[PDB]
């Protein structure tokens with residue numbers, strides 16, 4: 001708190017990774033105050049804290065709407081909205097630290113070369129912020145040996161919407177996962193090299209064989225949904241981006257990176273490690289409660305979009321400029337409060353569709369790996385629990401429309 005980060009401090013942070021909204025740097029200096037810690041720094045596209053409608057939508061959380069900055073905002077969103085839903089056991093909202101404009105600029109330039117080219121094209125750190133978040137580095141087993149192998153999972157959405165507000169033209173959405181569909185669109189725009197083999201419904205099934213099936217699939221095609229770290233260094237997956245298919249070569253390096261930690265012989269350490277991850281995922285049941293919060297998206301976007309316009313007090317352009325008689329009347333007949341509720345719960349779900357899980361292993365919650373004769377303690381943590389902006393409802397609808405439209409045309413080539 002009393003700590004204010006300056007330009008010299010910037011030499012003491014290395015590139016860890018990034019998503020779309022934040023840059024994350026690992027500590028690599030000496031100070032006893034930041035050892036075993038990571039820093040989360042908000043980005044701005046190339047191209048005050050809450051909008052008027054946002055202040056309205058979130059009125060039920062007074063602490064949240066009076067947040068002096070977007071760093072406090074996130075902190076309070078986790079603490080006062082996501083925790084009551086997820087539980088505090090595996091959730092850390094982090095600690096604020098005052099930062100200088102110069103620190104931000106120097107760290108911005110420092111890491112540039114370690115960033116993916118397309119990431120740099122789209123956004124850099126927001127240097128107008130006077131704040132950042134310090135978090136426990138989850139690739140270290142606990143604060144204050146030996147080796148720690150850490151696994152990050154981005155599960156995405158693990159259920160299927162029902163047809164009440166999905167017209168027959170988009171019927172596939174009720175039988176094919178958003179994840180599997182987005183794949184084709186992404187491949188088309190060259191945002192990935194191949195289609196994933198990961199099915200989120202498998203991971204969320206609560207069935208052990210299907211959870212192990214998902215892990216194997218996540219190993220084969222990690223993309224941006226699977227990362228492995230050895231004592232804080234990336235040994236599988238992409239750095240701030242999606243990575244391609246696991247080649248025999250990435251297979252060798254990772255298998256060999258596992259000696260010391262997993263005791264097998266020889267090229268079977270991978271198999272047993274996947275088993276390990278799979279056993280920790282199922283046995284902790286940490287996914288079940290995440291699914292419950294994803295299911296707060298009760299109506300799908302094709303439903304919720306209508307409530308969105310009532311909330312912003314705007315003549316619905318979907319019901320207008322579409323066929324009358326196909327105007328979604330039941331939704332618009334709702335009391336304001338129900339409409340506000342539905343869209344609030346839609347945003348929260350979107351947080352849960354887009355967050356990540358980090359699992360920390362060390363040799364001795366535990367897993368008894370039979371095929372190696374080892375025992376591993378684990379720790380589970382939810383990360384990347386960002387507040388989604390209200391105005392994004394419109395782009396969600398447009399992206400969704402684009403997803404199913406592209407997927408239909410591809411399927412129609414029968």
Ligand SMILES: O=P(O)(O)O[C@H]1[C@H](OP(=O)(O)O)[C@@H](OP(=O)(O)O)[C@H](OP(=O)(O)O)[C@@H](OP(=O)(O)O)[C@H]1OP(=O)(O)O
Nearest residue numbers: 018019020021022182224241350351354355384386388392
């Ligand atoms: O930038 P990417 O790695 O491709 O991932 C993005 C990104 O997620 P993260 O930033 O959490 O990594 C978006 O989030 P923003 O940073 O833009 O907030 C998120 O968008 P929403 O969470 O708002 O949906 C989107 O998710 P989706 O594509 O399901 O909308 C998701 O894309 P992928 O997970 O598909 O890569």
Ligand SMILES: Nc1ncnc2c1ncn2[C@@H]1O[C@H](COP(=O)(O)OP(=O)(O)O)[C@@H](O)[C@H]1O
Nearest residue numbers: 017018019020021022024135136137138139384
């Ligand atoms: N507390 C943490 N410990 C270890 N790694 C982290 C932590 N927070 C983030 N990361 C890593 O940094 C990356 C980006 O973090 P994230 O919060 O997902 O950024 P964004 O908000 O842009 O999506 C993640 O993919 C994750 O691997």
Ligand SMILES: [Mg+2]
Nearest residue numbers: 019021384386
């Ligand atoms: Mg995010």
Ligand SMILES: [Zn+2]
Nearest residue numbers: 306316318319
């Ligand atoms: Zn409408």
